[PDB]
């Protein structure tokens, strides 16, 4: 009579790779790597996106005539700016620092509009549409012009008398000639001013040609700025300039989320959104995309990083087929469980699960996957950034960041996962011995350890002998 | 007569974790994580701070009239501003690139202030002041206005013949009208230049008024420059310009440590300085601060990094209480070592720790503990910098960096704390089974492995017998 | 009779150190840290360098009448500045965003010089030349100066028809006096403009004294732009202006990699190229330098990181000799083989290798060591970069990258070998003891494990009978 210890094999065809060895067969495996996106543009923890369609960021700031204003109490978490959005400003020209405008505007906890200089307190013409701008002009600021072949000083002023700062707008006009300069505002040297308790800028009148665009020669410089709470705002000029209107109200801004993308909007609630589609994870790392908002696993290029659970899934050669144990390999036939036992006597074989053995090993490997999931932090994310012309060094120390973050990411990842798979597959050789172990010393002197799993019984040992053996209760100083 | 080999259990109530068990408790731990400070601002390795109780920074570089000047061998390695450091500029205006100009001053290692255009050399008026400014001016520039109603051209020139580079500073002034102007510079439209070998800056002038500070409504526009040895200053002005008097000569500047903060200081020397409080660590982990200076520990945001260093202290269950080693669990009595012999014969039983085994464990238990502490480089520093509101993105790529950073050593410290745990675990099973297969050896076939821990004697064996066991001169030959 | 089981002890001096132990004896090892380099610089697989002897990166920008233009087709992935390199600029003055357009030039996959304002086509004089230019002018730009006491406002356009954007180049020139600017524009005040459709700048004279250079007291400020495909560049001016003439067409531009360095260059191809020298390497790590471009090994300064491949190299300590096998250390004599057998019987002693064992091992190993070399990637380079007086901030940004990311490395380098050498040399342990316990199972009860490697045989066994044992074929139930 024989009592044999063994271990499971199955129908898997699961491989894994480990430091010393390459595609190893393992009886259960998971990944690490999440590879699955919804193809959608959803909403995030954060928030619900804007969706431009045929407005840039900066159209809605300054208000292109062509734009929809803003819903009274909107929020948004990020931007999405369609192929189609090609409303920026209307009148030509050119934003100052339009990179860090657009990051401002990217987000808002509860937006507002906000009247700052009525227009029909001025003194001067204040109506002046252009056919570049729709045959009207921005929303957001009102263009001063002579009245009745005049254009005296005007000044006014403006407290923030909100709680929260008030993003504002205004541009400089530089005619095409001469002889505008002094249609749209008679005095041919004009004065400027914008100031607040933080800030003063001056600015002189020129004009000449440009290159045309549309048709048009003369140019804009868009400028805008911030009042803080109990700020004030003086405006002066007497000409050339586009003097703000209304005012935006920040509250939740400067989080920087933009996204140029196709991908269709969706109805949907999601922790990691990239351009291509959002994603719900568990997982420590994910392959989709380097730029992702939201609680994102780490980005790691590469197909696969599977994580052995369960044993090497070689079983025993086939060749009638003798008695042996896990020395050999694994049983096909084990069902209930990892680790368990085969046994031979009068009364015929049996197979069965030993459970102890097994739940200790799987409560060990479970842990071992929980810990290397929940250690990993998922608070902050690699969003990509827009950088102007003369700023290519801090593009590429800002990509430098993104890179070698992701070198580190990769191998560490990589690494760990070869060196955990040999621990696992020796761990669960360790666990099959020391079950063989403990049979070993329960059996004492009564067996002969073949050692092969297997033990030769000095003296018959029926079904009910058996079971004590596995349940632990047999002695080996009994006596019948 | 038998002859146990087993190993230390104590009254310890330290667990720690491991990759695949939660809170097993050990004989001895080791925090990683370095989590007290001294609640002082101290001096560190690179110098002592200066404390600025009433004058921002700014307030020293132009020398604001409420600001005492440096003494002239001073040193310091960081800069501290309370919340009362007010004094900054005096005159309203704004400071062309104020961070950085905070970031130059920053640090010294031997300061000296240097005349650099006397006040008597210039033939206009040199001695303006201003409510503003304590009825004062500054006293490292020179306010220029015009002398019997006129204001010729005034230039001069100043030879930087130190061996280290000056800072300078100067200023253009906008009054609020043209009223003003007049009074102050007589010409309407001034022209004033800046230059060296490296630079040239022109400047024209302009007037009108301004949101009113304090009851002011002119401005000034305030710059800085650095005038490298051997090069050349020409100053020329027809109004407008307030001029540079004292340069300040920089020597280890620029190193960037600023802290607005209420700690209070000390008289006290430590490796690395936080804003709340600083400390000496052995440690590679601290957390107590993302940014600190000196020689410091890796920033981790968790309340522990417990590493083991001891057994597993579960002792042999009590139940009289039978006769068991290593194999069922720890010995509650063993008491000199790490690993020890019970032993049981006709003169009694005793209990006694090997020294060898003992000591060769600790020794590496000593090594790992000092290989995980000392590779950890402690030279570079994570410190808080200033930005303006244009300056968001590369604020963002900054914060990036420093939350990247923290992630990567955050998973890193965590697992490796969990990994070792588990070898060390496993490492004292090893030793104290490579104790017991020595004692096999030696004991041959004279003995009955039970293999507990325990040896059952085929001979009877006196406490000589057993001490010859202990200390490996038993012979499983002899014959006596 | 015995037959005993060791392992290879070897004339090595290698020493590694682990976790857990220092200076370890092993029979071979294998460094990871590549330590040469060729000291010449040398093309990439990016390309070739250009070397400057006399001329800066801005001298060819601009065109510096004592620099060879550059030929029609000529490609380069890095540039080379020796220090004889001093012709810029030649006319005294400042170039805008200098760090940017050195970038800028940095790199080109195929050059080309095209002409945009064809000199003969402007109305005034267009050849004016300057003893601070050798008597000539530039070669990229033409100095506009008065015909015949007049300067009628000039204006020229020019389109780029090219597929791909063209680098161009102007300056403003301020006199040193009033009569200086009447002897070259005979306009007291004059207006410049630059514009394209998507930037329009705007520039007034000046004029005064400056700090003398080389006897010169007029100031240049030297600018550029890039004029994108389809775009209409239009200049005007009255006077002031050095306008454009050739523009530089942008391919694979903006690489950034530039060496101010001595270094001899060489006719030779390397993977990775620095300040000192380049070189080839398969290795992950290098100690050579921080700042390096191509295909590099992550930087990690220390002088070694060794791998341990062989086992721990301690003989059994010779004192005759007795008989023992891998319990007490190595066999000095063991030749062809990791692993292995020694026999005596009455024809004598023997000592033969066991290849399976041995090539199983090697295989492990080897897998080991090209997984730590080949999951580095090798992309991403870190580079020197510029920045200017008020950049320092970015400049600390930058460092602090460069420096976290090398800690990072240095320590999971140090630590990975550490950990890795620790289990390397308990894996042979394992490898030598599970051929101990094949050779057990195939002898079972005909032999005594003294177990030290040796097996005391409880029958004769000549020569044959040895070698039936050694190669698997000995059956524990022969009758003969
Ligand atoms: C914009 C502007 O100049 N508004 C003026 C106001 O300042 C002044 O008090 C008054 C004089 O008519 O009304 C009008
Ligand atoms: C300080 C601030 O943010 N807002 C203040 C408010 O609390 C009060 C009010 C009375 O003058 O003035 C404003
Ligand atoms: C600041 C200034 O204009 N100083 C002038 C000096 O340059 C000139 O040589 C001389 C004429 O009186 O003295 C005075
Ligand atoms: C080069 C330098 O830094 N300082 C020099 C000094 O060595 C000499 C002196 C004589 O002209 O000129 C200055
Ligand atoms: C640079 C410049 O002003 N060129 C002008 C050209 O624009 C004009 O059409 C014509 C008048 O003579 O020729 C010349
Ligand atoms: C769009 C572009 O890059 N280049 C275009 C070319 O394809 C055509 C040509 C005809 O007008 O105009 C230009």
Not at 289 to 300: L, Q, W
Not at 320 to 326: H, L, Q, T
Request: charged share 20%; net charge negative.
């Amino acid at each position: 009579d024989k009592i044999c210890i063994g271990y499971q094999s199955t129908n898997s065809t699961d491989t894994v790779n480990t430091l010393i060895e390459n595609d190893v067969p393992v009886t259960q495996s998971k990944e690490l790597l999440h590879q699955e996106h919804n193809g959608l543009l959803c909403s995030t923890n954060r928030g619900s996106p804007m969706e431009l369609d045929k407005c840039k960021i900066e159209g809605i700031v300054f208000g292109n005539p062509e734009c929809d204003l803003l819903l009274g109490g909107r929020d948004w978490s990020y931007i999405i700016e369609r192929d189609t959005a090609k409303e920026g400003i209307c009148y030509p020209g050119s934003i100052e620092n339009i990179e860090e405008l657009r990051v401002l505007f990217s987000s808002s906890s509860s937006y507002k509009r906000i009247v700052m200089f009525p227009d029909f307190a001025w003194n001067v013409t204040y109506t002046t549409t252009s056919p570049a701008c729709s045959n009207s002009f921005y929303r957001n600021m009102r263009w001063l012009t002579k009245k009745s072949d005049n254009f005296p000083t005007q000044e006014a002023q403006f407290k923030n008398r909100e709680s929260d700062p008030i993003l504002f707008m205004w541009a400089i006009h530089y005619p095409s000639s001469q002889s505008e300069q002094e249609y749209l505002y008679k005095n041919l040297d004009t004065t400027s001013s914008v100031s607040t308790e933080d800030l003063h800028r001056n600015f002189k009148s020129a004009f000449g040609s440009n290159v045309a665009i549309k048709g048009i020669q003369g140019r804009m410089t868009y400028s805008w700025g911030i009042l803080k709470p109990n700020q004030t705002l003086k405006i002066r000029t007497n000409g050339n300039m586009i003097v703000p209107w209304y005012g935006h109200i920040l509250r939740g801004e400067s989080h920087g989320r933009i996204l140029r993308s196709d991908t269709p909007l969706g109805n949907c609630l999601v922790e990691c959104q990239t351009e291509r589609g959002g994603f719900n994870a568990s997982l420590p790392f994910q392959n989709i995309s380097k730029y992702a908002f939201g609680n994102c696993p780490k980005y790691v290029k590469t197909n696969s990083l599977k994580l052995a659970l369960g044993m090497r899934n070689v079983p025993i050669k086939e060749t009638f087929g003798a008695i042996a144990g896990f020395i050999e390999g694994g049983w096909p036939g084990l069902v209930a469980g990892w680790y368990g036992f085969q046994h031979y006597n009068s009364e015929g074989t049996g197979m069965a699960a030993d459970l102890t053995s097994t739940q200790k090993a799987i409560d060990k490997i479970t842990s071992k996957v929980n810990n290397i999931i929940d250690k990993m932090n998922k608070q902050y994310e690699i969003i990509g950034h827009e950088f102007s012309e003369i700023e290519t060094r801090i593009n590429m120390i800002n990509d430098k960041i993104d890179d070698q973050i992701q070198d580190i990411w990769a191998y560490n990842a990589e690494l760990l996962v070869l060196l955990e798979n040999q621990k696992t597959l020796d761990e669960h050789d360790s666990n099959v011995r020391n079950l063989y172990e403990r049979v070993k010393r329960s059996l004492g002197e009564n067996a002969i350890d073949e050692g092969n799993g297997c033990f030769e019984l000095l003296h018959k040992c029926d079904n009910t002998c058996m079971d004590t053996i596995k349940n632990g209760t047999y002695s080996k100083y009994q006596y019948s």
